[PDB]
Design a protein around this ligand. Structure first.
Ligand SMILES: *[C@@H]1O[C@H](CO)[C@@H](O)[C@H](O)[C@H]1NC(C)=O
Ligand SMILES: *[C@@H]1O[C@H](CO)[C@@H](O)[C@H](O)[C@H]1NC(C)=O
Ligand SMILES: *[C@@H]1O[C@H](CO)[C@@H](O)[C@H](O)[C@H]1NC(C)=O
Lengths: 91, 97, 96, 301, 49, 91, 50
């Protein structure tokens, strides 16, 4: 339900998308609501900061190993909510 | 006089009629996730529910052993009573003694 | 068997919405405020949290009702019509 | 005024509740309705993609058109033999027309339509309970070789026959967020490849404009307080629940629903003739039946 | 004394005997379709029962 | 079952087969008995004339041959009957 | 770690290698639920329980 894009062969740690800003979530209460990556959707090429809620490139992107879209899921507590993020990879 | 989940929950004068009336137990829910779907719950189709437990037709449950036919609706070859019959026999059929 | 038609939702970005009466079969309507709809591409309104969504729902006849349908009838007193073969002497007549 | 001109119509992206990764996603093939009313087990499926047509919209067998996932959203085409239908095992495909498939399926608790291999390889699964159907009063796994040839109703395999119609409307805004570019305290509308784009912003007041190049928005500081979407999108789209409607939601056109339910003849088994024993005021029937077979008795009084 | 659908519906003195006797309720039916197959119904094997 | 041959790339409307003569049916009775193609088994390459009961080419014969043979079914009422026609393609 | 349909056995195989072998064990696995309503697939509109 979240739409993001990355470029082909993108460097590690580079910006992908602000999850907390797009969801309208407050910035000072990610840790209080236990922001966490859903265990069902684990992507080796992506990693998200728990404190800031900003998605970043973890491993170097390669279409040959991937191929397509990258799927990720996050879950929050109090109240229990689930959100889905999909990333398109250019060539 | 439609009832939800029962036969005749949707009614019209004809299949192509525009004055369709129905009272299905449909209700719209608040969207939980932030997509653009419409969440709703509805009662089951009363026509399907009637089909599930319609019982046996009158072609199998009818007294006096007579068979039900459609177009027009009728019950043919029923053996139940006595018919008084009066015949005016023409005099050409008779012969002298 | 009815076919439930769910039309395309109406979304108005922080302006109030309400729906009027309709002549459609079993027309059920409800409006929800404070939404933030998303599609493929991103957010759908320019306004933060006063966005409203109008959801419609009705029913119609299924495409296969031309074959699988039931007809309700009220029947009155029935009349008996018989086919008679009458042989008088040696003349045979068939009649109704 | 039902039309067959598919150049005026376009496919769309739906919200499938069960994708290849077992979670709901936006899909070019979304299952809207499934009908199972034919007596031979065939089903008719409505899919958000259009089959039997090329990229331009002309009638082209072995080509199907769908909606791309890119930000400059356009209509793509692909070959038809990679379209797969399943319920519990593979399903034979009996016919295809725009928005509609007709298939022969084994019994199952779900219906899946998938694009196998190539680009945009995906699937869509819906909870749809279909079961084996019967015509006569004797059960049969397979149609018997010697029977009675009773009247039944099946879906017509000819796509020219019509079972009804669906309404077609002008599409609403889609509002891609990639058209927005955030700068150092200001936002820009960034149309793709010079295509004209309409923006609606709520900077300090409601402002609406049409641009063709990258354009500064003066009053807005964040991208989330304004939207922009492609203009001049006069391609009719089916009235689906997964799309925001246009301001004018009048019925622009009508499309045929192919594979109408038609009468025909079809065989049903004839059971083994029972052995009758007579005793005073009663009979004894000796019944033999491999499959469940219905027996009915009634008195004639 | 063979009976259809019951034990002993087919009998012989030995498994290789040519004097096999049986009373399985075979009913040959009129061919419905325009082919050459022989349609028939039979009682269930009483040995299996 | 009523199989017969058709040449590769045969012209549209050419004489192909005769259902009515092979089944001993007259024109008037099949017109009264609603001699129609069965909606299950239909082929885009072949059509029958509704009064003479003669199969002819609709679409020109091509190499994909659906899967292989051509299959068609017809049905009549009073009495209710189903007939199957098989067509060989001579390549 | 796999996602499997219901069945009464578990098989792990090498499809096309030089080994070309499979191992099958008896293991009854069935569909699992989270709530008080049965479901074949998780619905779009739900309650989001733990
Ligand atoms: C109703 O239908 C279900 C499944 O479709 C079947 O098991 C049941 O016997 C039917 N009848 C009643 C009376 O529940
Ligand atoms: C009735 O019978 C008489 C005497 O047997 C005979 O002359 C006469 O032709 C018969 N009538 C008819 C209509 O057959
Ligand atoms: C886009 O819309 C504008 C509105 O002024 C129009 O002038 C233009 O021709 C359109 N098409 C383009 C830029 O291709």
């Amino acid at each position: 339900q979240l739409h993001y894009t990355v470029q082909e062969e993108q460097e590690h740690g580079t910006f992908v998308g602000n999850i907390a800003e797009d969801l309208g979530l407050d910035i000072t209460k990610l840790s209080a609501r236990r922001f966490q990556t859903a265990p069902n959707s684990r992507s080796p090429y992506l990693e998200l900061n728990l404190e800031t809620g900003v998605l970043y490139v973890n491993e170097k992107i390669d279409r040959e190993q991937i191929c397509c879209l990258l799927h990720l899921e996050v879950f929050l507590e109090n109240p229990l909510e689930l959100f889905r993020v999909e990333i398109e990879v250019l060539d | 006089a439609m009832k939800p989940g029962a036969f005749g929950d949707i009614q019209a004068s004809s299949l192509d009629a525009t004055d369709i009336v129905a009272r299905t137990d449909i209700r719209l829910l608040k969207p939980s996730v932030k997509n653009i779907h419409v969440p709703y719950t509805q009662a089951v189709s009363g026509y399907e529910m009637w089909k599930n437990n319609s019982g046996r037709p009158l072609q199998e449950t009818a007294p006096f052993g007579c068979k039900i036919e459609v177009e027009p609706l009728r019950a043919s070859n029923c053996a139940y009573g006595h018919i008084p019959i009066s015949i005016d026999i023409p005099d050409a059929a008779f012969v002298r003694s | 068997k009815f076919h439930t038609v769910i039309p395309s939702p109406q979304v108005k970005c922080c302006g109030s919405l309400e729906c009027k009466a309709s002549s459609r079969a079993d027309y059920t309507c409800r409006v929800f405020g404070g939404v933030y709809p998303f599609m493929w591409g991103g957010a759908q309104c320019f306004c933060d949290s006063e966005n409203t969504q109008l959801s419609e729902a009705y029913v119609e006849f299924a495409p296969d009702c031309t074959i699988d349908h039931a007809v309700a009838l009220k029947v009155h007193t029935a009349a008996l019509k018989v086919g008679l073969r009458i042989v008088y002497g040696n003349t045979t007549a068939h009649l109704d | 005024s039902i039309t067959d001109d598919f150049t005026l119509t376009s496919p769309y992206l739906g919200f499938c509740p069960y994708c290849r990764h077992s979670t709901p996603c936006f899909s070019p093939i979304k299952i809207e309705n499934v009908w199972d009313e034919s007596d031979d087990g065939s089903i008719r499926i409505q899919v958000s993609a259009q089959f039997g047509y090329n990229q331009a919209g002309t009638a082209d067998v072995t080509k199907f058109r769908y909606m791309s996932f890119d930000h400059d959203h356009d209509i793509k085409e692909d070959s038809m033999e990679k379209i797969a239908i399943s319920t519990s095992g593979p399903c034979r495909r009996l016919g295809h027309k725009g928005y509609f498939l007709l298939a022969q399926c084994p019994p199952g608790d779900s219906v899946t339509v998938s694009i196998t291999s190539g680009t945009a390889e995906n699937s869509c699964t819906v909870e749809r309970k279909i079961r084996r159907k019967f015509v006569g009063r004797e059960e049969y796994l397979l149609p018997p070789i010697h029977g009675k040839q009773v009247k039944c109703h099946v879906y017509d395999h000819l796509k020219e026959t019509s079972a009804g119609y669906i309404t077609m409307h002008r599409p609403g805004p889609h509002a891609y967020k990639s058209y927005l570019e955030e700068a150092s305290g200001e936002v820009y509308i960034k149309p793709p490849s010079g295509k004209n784009v309409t923006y609606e912003c709520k900077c300090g007041d409601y402002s609406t404009g049409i641009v063709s190049t990258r354009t500064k928005i003066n009053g807005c500081t964040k991208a989330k307080q304004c939207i922009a979407y492609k203009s001049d999108q006069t391609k009719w789209v089916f009235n689906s629940p997964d799309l925001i409607r246009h301001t004018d939601h009048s019925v622009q056109g009508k499309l045929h629903i192919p594979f109408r339910l038609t009468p025909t003849v079809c065989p049903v088994p004839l059971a083994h003739t029972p052995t009758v024993m007579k005793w005073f005021k009663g009979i004894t029937l000796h019944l033999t039946a491999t499959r469940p077979t219905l027996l009915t008795t009634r008195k004639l009084g």
